[PDB]
CSV table of C-alpha atoms and ligand atoms in Angstrom, one decimal:
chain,number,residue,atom,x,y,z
A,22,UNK,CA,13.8,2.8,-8.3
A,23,UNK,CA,10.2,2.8,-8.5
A,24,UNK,CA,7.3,4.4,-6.8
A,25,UNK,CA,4.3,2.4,-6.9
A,26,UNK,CA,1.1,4.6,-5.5
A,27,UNK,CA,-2.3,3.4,-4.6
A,28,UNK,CA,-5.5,5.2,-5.6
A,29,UNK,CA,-8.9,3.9,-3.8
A,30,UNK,CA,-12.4,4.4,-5.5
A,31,UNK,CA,-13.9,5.3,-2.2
A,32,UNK,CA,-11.8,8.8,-1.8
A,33,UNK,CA,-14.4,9.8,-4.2
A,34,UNK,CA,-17.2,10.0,-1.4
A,35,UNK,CA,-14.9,12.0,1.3
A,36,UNK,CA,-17.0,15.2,1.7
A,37,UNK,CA,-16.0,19.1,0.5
A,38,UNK,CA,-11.9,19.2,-0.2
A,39,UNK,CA,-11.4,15.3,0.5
A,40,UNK,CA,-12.9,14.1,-2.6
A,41,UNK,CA,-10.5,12.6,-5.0
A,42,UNK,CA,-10.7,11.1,-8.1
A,43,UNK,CA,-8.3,10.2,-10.7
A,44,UNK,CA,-7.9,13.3,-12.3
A,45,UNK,CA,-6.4,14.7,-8.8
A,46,UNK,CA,-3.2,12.5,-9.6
A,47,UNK,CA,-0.2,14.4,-10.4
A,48,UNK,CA,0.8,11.5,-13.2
A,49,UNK,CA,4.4,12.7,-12.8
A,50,UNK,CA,4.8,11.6,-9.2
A,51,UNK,CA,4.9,8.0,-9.5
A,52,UNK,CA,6.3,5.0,-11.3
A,53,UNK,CA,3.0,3.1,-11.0
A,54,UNK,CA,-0.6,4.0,-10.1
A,55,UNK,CA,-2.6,1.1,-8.9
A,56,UNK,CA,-6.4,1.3,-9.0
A,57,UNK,CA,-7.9,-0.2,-5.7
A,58,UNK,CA,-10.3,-2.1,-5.9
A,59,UNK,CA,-12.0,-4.3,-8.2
A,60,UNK,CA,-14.4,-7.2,-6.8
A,61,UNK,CA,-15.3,-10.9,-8.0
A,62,UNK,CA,-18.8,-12.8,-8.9
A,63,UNK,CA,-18.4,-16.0,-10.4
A,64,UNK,CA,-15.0,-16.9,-10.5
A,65,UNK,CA,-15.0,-13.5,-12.8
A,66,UNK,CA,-13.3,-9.7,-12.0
A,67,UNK,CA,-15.7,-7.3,-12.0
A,68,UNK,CA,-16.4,-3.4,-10.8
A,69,UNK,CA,-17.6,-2.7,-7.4
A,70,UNK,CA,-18.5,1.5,-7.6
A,71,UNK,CA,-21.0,2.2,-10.7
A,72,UNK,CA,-18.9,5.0,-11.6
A,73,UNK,CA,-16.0,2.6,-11.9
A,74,UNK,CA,-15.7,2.2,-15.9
A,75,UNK,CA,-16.0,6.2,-15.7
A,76,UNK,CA,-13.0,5.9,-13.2
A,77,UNK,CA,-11.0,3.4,-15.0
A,78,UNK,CA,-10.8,6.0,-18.0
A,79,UNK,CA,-10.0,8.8,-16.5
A,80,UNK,CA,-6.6,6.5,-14.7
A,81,UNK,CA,-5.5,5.1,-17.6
A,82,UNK,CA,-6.2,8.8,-19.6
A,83,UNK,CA,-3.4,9.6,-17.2
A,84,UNK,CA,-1.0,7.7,-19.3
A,85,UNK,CA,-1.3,10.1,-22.3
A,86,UNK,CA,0.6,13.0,-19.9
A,87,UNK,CA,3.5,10.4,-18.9
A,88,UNK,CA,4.5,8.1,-21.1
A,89,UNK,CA,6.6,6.2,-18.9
A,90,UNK,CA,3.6,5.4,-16.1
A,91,UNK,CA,2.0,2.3,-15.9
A,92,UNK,CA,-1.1,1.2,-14.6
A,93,UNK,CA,-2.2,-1.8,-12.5
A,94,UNK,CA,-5.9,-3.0,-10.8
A,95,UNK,CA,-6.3,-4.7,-7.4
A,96,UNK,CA,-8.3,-7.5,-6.6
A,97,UNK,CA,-9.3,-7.9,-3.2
A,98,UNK,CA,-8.3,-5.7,0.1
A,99,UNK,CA,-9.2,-6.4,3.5
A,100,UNK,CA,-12.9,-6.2,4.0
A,101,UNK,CA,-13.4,-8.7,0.8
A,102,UNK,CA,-12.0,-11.3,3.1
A,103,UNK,CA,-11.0,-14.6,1.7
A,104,UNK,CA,-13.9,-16.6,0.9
A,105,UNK,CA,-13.9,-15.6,-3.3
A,106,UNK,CA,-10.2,-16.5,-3.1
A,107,UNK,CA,-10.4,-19.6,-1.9
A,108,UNK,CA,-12.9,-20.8,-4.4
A,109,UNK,CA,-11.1,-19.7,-7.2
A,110,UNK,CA,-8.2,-21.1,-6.7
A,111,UNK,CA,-9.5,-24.6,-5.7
A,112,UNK,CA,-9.9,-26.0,-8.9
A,113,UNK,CA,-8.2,-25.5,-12.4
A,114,UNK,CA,-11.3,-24.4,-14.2
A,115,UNK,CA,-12.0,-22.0,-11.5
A,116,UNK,CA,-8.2,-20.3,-11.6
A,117,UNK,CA,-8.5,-20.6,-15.8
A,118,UNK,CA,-11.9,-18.8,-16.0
A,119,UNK,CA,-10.3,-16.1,-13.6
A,120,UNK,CA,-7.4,-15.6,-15.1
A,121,UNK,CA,-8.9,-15.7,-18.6
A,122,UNK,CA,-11.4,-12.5,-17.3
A,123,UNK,CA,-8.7,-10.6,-16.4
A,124,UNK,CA,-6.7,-10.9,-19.6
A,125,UNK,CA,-10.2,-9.5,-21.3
A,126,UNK,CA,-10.8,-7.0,-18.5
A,127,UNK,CA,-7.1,-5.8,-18.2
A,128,UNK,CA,-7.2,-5.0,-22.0
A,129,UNK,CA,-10.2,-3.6,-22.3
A,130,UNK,CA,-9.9,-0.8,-19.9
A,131,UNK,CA,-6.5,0.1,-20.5
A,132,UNK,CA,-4.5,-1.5,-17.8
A,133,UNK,CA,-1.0,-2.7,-17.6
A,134,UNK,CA,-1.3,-5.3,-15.0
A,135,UNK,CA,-3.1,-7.0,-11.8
A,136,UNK,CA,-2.2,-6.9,-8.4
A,137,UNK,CA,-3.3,-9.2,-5.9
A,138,UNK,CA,-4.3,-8.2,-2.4
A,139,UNK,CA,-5.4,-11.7,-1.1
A,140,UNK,CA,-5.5,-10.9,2.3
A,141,UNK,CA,-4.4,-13.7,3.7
A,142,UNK,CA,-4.1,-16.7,1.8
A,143,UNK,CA,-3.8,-19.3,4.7
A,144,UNK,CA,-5.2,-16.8,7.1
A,145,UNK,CA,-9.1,-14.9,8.2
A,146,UNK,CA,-10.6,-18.7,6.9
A,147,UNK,CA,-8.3,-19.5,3.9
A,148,UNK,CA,-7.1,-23.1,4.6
A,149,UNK,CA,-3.5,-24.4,4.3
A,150,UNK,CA,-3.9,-25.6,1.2
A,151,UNK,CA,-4.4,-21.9,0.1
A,152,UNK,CA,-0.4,-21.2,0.9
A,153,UNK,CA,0.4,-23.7,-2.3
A,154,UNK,CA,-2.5,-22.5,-4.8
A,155,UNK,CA,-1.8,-19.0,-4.4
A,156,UNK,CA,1.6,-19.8,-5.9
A,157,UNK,CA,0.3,-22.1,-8.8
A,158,UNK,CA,-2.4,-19.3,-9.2
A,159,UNK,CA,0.3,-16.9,-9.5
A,160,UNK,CA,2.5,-18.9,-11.9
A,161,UNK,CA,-0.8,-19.8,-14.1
A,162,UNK,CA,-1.3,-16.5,-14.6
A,163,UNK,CA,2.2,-15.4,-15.0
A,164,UNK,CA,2.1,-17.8,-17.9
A,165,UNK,CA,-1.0,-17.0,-19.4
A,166,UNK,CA,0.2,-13.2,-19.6
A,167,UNK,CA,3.4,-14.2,-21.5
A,168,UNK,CA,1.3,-16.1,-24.2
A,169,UNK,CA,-1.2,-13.8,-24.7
A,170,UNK,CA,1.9,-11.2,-25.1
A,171,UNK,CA,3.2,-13.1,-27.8
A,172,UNK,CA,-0.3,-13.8,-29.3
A,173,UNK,CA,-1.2,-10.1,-29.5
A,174,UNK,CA,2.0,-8.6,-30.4
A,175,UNK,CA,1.7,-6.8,-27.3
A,176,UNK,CA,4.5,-6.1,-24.3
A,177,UNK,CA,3.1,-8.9,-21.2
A,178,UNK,CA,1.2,-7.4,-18.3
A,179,UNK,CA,2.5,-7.6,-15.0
A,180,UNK,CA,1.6,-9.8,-12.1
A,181,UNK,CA,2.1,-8.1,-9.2
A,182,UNK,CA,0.5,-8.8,-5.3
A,183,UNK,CA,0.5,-6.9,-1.9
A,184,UNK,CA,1.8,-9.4,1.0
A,185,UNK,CA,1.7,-9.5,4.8
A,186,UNK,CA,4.0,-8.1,7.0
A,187,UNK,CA,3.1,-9.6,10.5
A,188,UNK,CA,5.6,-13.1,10.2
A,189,UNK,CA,2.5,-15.2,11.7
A,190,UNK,CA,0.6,-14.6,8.4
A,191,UNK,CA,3.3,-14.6,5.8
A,192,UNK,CA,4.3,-18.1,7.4
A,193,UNK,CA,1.1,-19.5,6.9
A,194,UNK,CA,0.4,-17.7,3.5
A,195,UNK,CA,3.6,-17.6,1.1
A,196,UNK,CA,6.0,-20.6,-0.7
A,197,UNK,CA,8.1,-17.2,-0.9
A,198,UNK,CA,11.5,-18.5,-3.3
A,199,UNK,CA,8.7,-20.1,-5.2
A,200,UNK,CA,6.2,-17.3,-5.3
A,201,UNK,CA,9.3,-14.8,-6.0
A,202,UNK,CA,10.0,-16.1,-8.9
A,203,UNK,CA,6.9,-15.2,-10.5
A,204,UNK,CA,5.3,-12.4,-9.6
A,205,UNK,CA,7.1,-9.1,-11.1
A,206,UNK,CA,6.7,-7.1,-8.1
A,207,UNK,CA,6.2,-7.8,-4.1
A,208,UNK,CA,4.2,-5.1,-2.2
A,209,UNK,CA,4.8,-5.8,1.5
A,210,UNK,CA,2.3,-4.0,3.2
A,211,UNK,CA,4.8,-2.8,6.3
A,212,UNK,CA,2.2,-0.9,7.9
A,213,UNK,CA,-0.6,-0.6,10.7
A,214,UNK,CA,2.2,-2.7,12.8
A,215,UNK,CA,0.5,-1.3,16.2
A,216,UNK,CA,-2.9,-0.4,16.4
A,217,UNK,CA,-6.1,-0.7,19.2
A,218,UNK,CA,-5.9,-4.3,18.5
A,219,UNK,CA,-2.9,-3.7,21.2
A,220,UNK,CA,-4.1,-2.4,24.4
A,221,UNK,CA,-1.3,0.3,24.3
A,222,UNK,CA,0.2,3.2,22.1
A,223,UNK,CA,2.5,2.1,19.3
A,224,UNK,CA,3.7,3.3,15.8
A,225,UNK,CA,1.8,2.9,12.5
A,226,UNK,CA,5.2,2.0,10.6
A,227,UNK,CA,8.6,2.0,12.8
A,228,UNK,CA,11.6,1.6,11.1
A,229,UNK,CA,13.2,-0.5,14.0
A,230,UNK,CA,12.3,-1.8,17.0
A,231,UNK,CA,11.9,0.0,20.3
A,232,UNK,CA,14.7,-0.7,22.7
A,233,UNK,CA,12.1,-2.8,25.0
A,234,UNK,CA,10.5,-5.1,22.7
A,235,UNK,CA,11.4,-8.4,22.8
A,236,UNK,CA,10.0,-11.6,21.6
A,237,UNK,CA,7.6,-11.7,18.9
A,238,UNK,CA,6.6,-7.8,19.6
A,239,UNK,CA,10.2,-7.3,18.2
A,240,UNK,CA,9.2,-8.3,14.2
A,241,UNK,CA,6.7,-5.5,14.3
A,242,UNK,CA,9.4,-3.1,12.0
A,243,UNK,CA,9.7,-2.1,8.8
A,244,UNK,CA,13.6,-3.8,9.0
A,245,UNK,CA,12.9,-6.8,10.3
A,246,UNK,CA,10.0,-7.5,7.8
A,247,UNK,CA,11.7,-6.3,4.6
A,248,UNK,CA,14.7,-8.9,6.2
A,249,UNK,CA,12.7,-11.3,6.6
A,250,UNK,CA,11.4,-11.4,2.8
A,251,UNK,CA,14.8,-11.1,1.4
A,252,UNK,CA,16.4,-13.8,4.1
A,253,UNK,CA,13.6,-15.9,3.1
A,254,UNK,CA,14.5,-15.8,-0.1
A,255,UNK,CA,12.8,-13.2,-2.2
A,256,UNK,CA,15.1,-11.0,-4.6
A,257,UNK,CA,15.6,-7.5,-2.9
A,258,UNK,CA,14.9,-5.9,-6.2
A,259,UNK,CA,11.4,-7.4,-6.5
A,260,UNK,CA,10.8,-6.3,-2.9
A,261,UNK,CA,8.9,-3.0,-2.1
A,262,UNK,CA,8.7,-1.4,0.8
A,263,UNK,CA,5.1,0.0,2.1
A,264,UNK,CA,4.7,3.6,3.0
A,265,UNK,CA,1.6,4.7,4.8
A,266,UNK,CA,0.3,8.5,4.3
A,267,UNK,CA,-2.0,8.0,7.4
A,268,UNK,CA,-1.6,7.8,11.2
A,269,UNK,CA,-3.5,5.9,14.2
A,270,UNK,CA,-4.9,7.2,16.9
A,271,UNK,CA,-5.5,5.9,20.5
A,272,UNK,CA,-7.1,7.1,23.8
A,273,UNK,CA,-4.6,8.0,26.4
A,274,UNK,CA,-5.5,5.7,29.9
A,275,UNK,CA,-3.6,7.8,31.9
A,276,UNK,CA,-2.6,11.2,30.1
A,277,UNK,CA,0.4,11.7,32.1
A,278,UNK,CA,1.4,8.2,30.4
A,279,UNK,CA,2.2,9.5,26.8
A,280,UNK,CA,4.9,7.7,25.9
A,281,UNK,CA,5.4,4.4,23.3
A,282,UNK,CA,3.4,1.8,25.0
A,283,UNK,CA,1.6,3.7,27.1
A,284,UNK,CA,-1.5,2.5,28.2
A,285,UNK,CA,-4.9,3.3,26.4
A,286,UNK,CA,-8.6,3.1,26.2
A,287,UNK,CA,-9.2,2.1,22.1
A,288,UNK,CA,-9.3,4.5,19.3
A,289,UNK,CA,-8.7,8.7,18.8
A,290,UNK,CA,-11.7,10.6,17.2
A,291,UNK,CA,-12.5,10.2,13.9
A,292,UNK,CA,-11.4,12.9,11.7
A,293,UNK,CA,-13.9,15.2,9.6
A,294,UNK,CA,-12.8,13.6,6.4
A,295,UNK,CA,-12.3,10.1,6.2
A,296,UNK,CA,-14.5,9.3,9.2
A,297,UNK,CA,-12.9,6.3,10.8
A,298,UNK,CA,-12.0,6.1,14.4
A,299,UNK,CA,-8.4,5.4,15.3
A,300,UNK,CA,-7.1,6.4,11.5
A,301,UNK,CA,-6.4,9.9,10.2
A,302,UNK,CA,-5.4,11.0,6.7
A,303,UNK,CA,-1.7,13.1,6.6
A,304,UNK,CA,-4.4,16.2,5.6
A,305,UNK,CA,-6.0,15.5,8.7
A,306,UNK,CA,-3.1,15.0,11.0
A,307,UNK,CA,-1.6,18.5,9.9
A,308,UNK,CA,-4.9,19.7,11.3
A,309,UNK,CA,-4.1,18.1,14.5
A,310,UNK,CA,-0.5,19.0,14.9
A,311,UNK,CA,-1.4,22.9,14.5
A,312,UNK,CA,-4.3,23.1,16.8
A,313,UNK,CA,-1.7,22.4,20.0
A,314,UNK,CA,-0.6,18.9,19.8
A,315,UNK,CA,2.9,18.3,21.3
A,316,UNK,CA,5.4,16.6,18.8
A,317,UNK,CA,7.9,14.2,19.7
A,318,UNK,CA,10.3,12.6,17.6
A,319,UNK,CA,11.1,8.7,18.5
A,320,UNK,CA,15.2,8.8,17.5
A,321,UNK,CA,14.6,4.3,18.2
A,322,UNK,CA,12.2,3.9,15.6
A,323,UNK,CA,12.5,6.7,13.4
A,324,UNK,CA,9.4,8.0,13.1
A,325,UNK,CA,7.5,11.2,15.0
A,326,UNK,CA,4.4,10.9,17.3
A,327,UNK,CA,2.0,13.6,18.6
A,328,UNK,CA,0.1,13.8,22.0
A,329,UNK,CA,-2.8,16.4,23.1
A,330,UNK,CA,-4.6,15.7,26.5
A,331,UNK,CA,-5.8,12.3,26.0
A,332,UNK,CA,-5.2,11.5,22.3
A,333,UNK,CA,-2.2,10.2,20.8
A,334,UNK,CA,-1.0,9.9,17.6
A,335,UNK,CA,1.7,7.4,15.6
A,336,UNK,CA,2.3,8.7,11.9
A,337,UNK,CA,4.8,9.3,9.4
A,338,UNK,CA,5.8,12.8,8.1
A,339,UNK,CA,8.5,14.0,5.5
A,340,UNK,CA,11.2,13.3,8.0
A,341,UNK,CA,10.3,9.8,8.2
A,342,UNK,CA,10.1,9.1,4.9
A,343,UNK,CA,13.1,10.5,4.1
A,344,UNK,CA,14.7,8.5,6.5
A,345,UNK,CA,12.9,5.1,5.4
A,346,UNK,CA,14.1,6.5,1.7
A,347,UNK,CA,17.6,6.7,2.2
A,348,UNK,CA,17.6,3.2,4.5
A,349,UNK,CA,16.1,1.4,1.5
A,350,UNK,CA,18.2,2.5,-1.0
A,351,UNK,CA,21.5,1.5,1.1
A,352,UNK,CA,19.7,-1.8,1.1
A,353,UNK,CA,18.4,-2.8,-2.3
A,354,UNK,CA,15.3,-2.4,-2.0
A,355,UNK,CA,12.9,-1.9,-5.4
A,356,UNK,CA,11.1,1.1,-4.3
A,357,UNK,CA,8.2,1.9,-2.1
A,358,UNK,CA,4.8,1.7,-2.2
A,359,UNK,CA,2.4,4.0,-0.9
A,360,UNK,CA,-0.9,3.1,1.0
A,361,UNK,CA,-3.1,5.7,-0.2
A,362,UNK,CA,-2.4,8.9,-2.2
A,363,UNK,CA,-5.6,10.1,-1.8
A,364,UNK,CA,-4.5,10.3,1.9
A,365,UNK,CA,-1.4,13.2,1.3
A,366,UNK,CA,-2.3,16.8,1.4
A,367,UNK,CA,-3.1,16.6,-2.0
A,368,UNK,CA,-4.5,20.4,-2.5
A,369,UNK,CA,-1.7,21.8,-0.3
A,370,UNK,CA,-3.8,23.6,2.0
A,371,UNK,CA,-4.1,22.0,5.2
A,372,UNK,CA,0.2,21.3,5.6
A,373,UNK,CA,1.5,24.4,3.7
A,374,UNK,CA,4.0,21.4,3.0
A,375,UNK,CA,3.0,21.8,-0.7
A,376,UNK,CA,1.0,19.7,-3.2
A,377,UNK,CA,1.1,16.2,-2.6
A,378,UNK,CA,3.8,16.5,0.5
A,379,UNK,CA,4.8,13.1,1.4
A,380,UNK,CA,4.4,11.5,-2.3
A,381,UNK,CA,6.6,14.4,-3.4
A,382,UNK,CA,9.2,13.7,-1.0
A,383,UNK,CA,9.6,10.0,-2.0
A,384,UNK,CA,9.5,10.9,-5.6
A,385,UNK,CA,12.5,13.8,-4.8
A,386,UNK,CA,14.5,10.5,-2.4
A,387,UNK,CA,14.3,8.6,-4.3
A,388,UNK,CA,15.5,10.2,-8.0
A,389,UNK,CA,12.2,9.7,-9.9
A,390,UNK,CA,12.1,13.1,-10.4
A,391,UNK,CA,15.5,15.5,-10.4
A,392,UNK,CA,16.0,19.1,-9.6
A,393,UNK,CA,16.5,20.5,-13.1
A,394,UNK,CA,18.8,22.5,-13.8
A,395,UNK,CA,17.2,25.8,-16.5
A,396,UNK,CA,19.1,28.6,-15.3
A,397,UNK,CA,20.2,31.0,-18.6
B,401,LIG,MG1,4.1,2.2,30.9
C-alpha cells in the first residue's frame, strides 16, 4: 500500500508552534510527500512563495534519510481556479511548452513527479471541452515522461492528479477508463463532503451514508465515491482514498438540536492557528475536545463529532482512520492520501496522542511501517 501525504508551503506562516516546514516531516511516515503548490505564468510552472526553491531543497533533502520516498509537486488547488488550465490545454503548443517546463523544472529541483489538482476541469468556468483535453493533456505528458526516461537514462516520473469526489463534478470533468489508463496514481479528494455551503451539520468525511439521506445527498461518502471511480472504470489499485487531518465547524441554530443535520447558523470560530472559520487543524481540535466539548461517536457513518453550547464539530480521529484503513484494504484500494500533514499534531503536545498522531496511525494500518521485533 502506499501513503501519499501532502505538505503545503503556507503552514510555514501559522504563528508560534504551527509553523511547519519541510524539515518537520518525519520522512519515514509516508510512501510519498507531495509539495503543494506550485503556480503557472505563461503556459510555464513556476514558484508562488519566494522561499520556495529554499523549500523545494529542503523536501527533496528528505530523500537522503529514506531511500524508498519519493517526491511529487502540485499544480493548481482550489483558489487558482481554472482559468490557467483552460488555456493551456487549448492548443498543442500551449500543452507542449507546459509540459516541456515541467520536465526541466521536475529535474532540476529534485522531484520525482507532478500532480495535478485542476480543480475542476469542466467545472468553476472550465468548458466541456476541458473534460476531453485534460485527458489528452494527461496522456501527452505521460508520454513525454517515458521519452525523456529513455533519453536520460533515468527511471520516468510520475503523472499523478487529485480528482473530485462530489459525482456532479467528476461527471462533467473526467473520460475516467481513458484517463485511468494514464495517470500512475488517482487522488480522490473524499473530503469536505458537508460543509456551511449546507445549511445544516454534516461530516467532513463519512464513511457511509446516514440512515436518512436519500437522493443525491446519499453520494456524499467516502464508499460510494471510491465505488463510483472503480464502477466507472478506474483500476482499484490506481485509486487512492483521501484522508483529511482537519474538521469543520458550524454554528448550532438551536443548541438543543445537536445532532447530524441539525440546523445551523454558518461557520465555528476560527482557531488560533490556521485562522479560517468553519475549519480546524487535528492540533486544534484536540484543544477543543479537552476544554469540555461532548464527544459522540456516529456508529452510521463511522466517524466521531463533537458539540459545546453552540458549536459543532465533524472530524476524523485515530478511530476513524483506523476504520477507513481496514475498509480500504478489504477493498483494493491503493492507499490513502492525506490532506495536509502539516495539519496532525505534529509536535505531540496538544493530543498527548504522540508525534504525528493520525499520519502515524495510517502508516501502523496500513503496514508501511511494522512493529519490530529487537528484543535480546
Ligand atoms: Mg432536525
Amino acid at each position: 500500500y502506499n501513503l501519499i501525504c501532502y505538505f503545503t508551503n503556507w503552514a510555514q506562516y501559522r504563528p508560534g508552534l504551527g509553523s511547519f516546514k519541510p524539515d518537520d516531516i518525519n520522512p519515514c511516515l509516508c510512501t510519498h510527500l507531495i509539495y503543494a503548490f506550485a503556480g503557472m505564468q505563461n503556459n510555464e510552472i513556476t514558484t508562488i512563495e519566494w522561499n520556495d526553491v529554499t523549500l523545494y531543497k529542503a523536501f527533496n533533502d528528505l530523500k537522503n534519510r529514506n531511500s524508498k520516498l519519493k517526491t511529487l509537486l502540485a499544480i493548481g488547488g482550489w483558489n487558482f481556479g481554472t482559468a490557467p488550465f483552460t488555456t493551456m490545454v487549448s492548443t498543442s503548443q500551449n500543452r507542449q511548452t507546459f509540459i516541456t517546463s515541467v520536465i526541466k523544472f521536475l529535474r532540476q529541483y529534485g522531484f520525482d513527479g507532478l500532480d495535478l489538482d485542476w480543480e475542476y476541469p469542466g467545472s468553476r468556468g472550465s468548458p466541456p471541452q476541458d473534460k476531453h483535453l485534460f485527458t489528452v493533456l494527461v496522456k501527452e505528458m505521460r508520454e513525454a515522461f517515458e521519452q525523456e526516461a529513455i533519453e536520460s537514462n533515468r527511471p520516468r516520473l510520475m503523472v499523478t492528479a487529485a480528482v473530485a469526489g462530489g459525482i456532479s463534478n467528476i461527471q462533467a470533468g473526467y473520460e475516467i477508463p481513458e484517463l485511468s489508463k494514464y495517470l500512475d496514481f488517482i487522488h480522490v479528494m473524499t473530503y469536505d463532503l458537508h460543509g456551511s455551503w449546507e445549511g445544516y451539520t454534516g461530516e467532513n468525511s463519512p464513511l457511509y451514508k446516514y440512515p436518512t439521506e436519500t437522493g443525491s445527498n446519499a453520494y456524499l461518502n467516502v464508499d460510494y465515491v471510491m465505488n463510483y471511480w472503480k464502477n466507472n472504470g478506474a483500476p482499484a489499485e490506481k485509486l487512492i482514498v483521501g484522508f483529511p487531518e482537519y474538521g469543520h465547524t458550524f454554528i448550532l441554530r438551536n443548541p438543543s438540536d445537536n445532532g447530524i443535520g441539525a440546523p445551523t447558523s454558518g461557520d465555528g470560530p476560527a482557531g488560533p492557528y490556521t485562522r479560517q472559520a468553519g475549519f480546524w487543524a487535528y492540533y486544534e481540535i484536540c484543544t477543543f475536545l479537552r476544554s469540555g466539548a461532548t464527544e459522540v461517536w456516529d456508529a452510521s457513518q463511522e466517524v466521531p463529532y463533537a458539540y459545546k453550547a453552540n458549536e459543532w464539530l465533524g472530524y476524523d480521529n485515530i478511530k476513524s482512520f483506523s476504520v477507513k484503513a481496514q475498509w480500504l484494504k478489504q477493498n483494493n484500494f491503493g492507499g490513502a492520501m492525506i490532506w495536509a500533514i502539516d495539519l496532525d499534531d505534529f509536535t505531540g503536545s496538544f493530543c498527548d496522542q504522540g508525534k504525528f498522531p493520525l499520519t502515524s496511525t495510517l502508516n501502523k494500518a496500513l503496514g508501511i511501517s511494522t512493529h519490530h521485533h529487537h528484543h535480546h
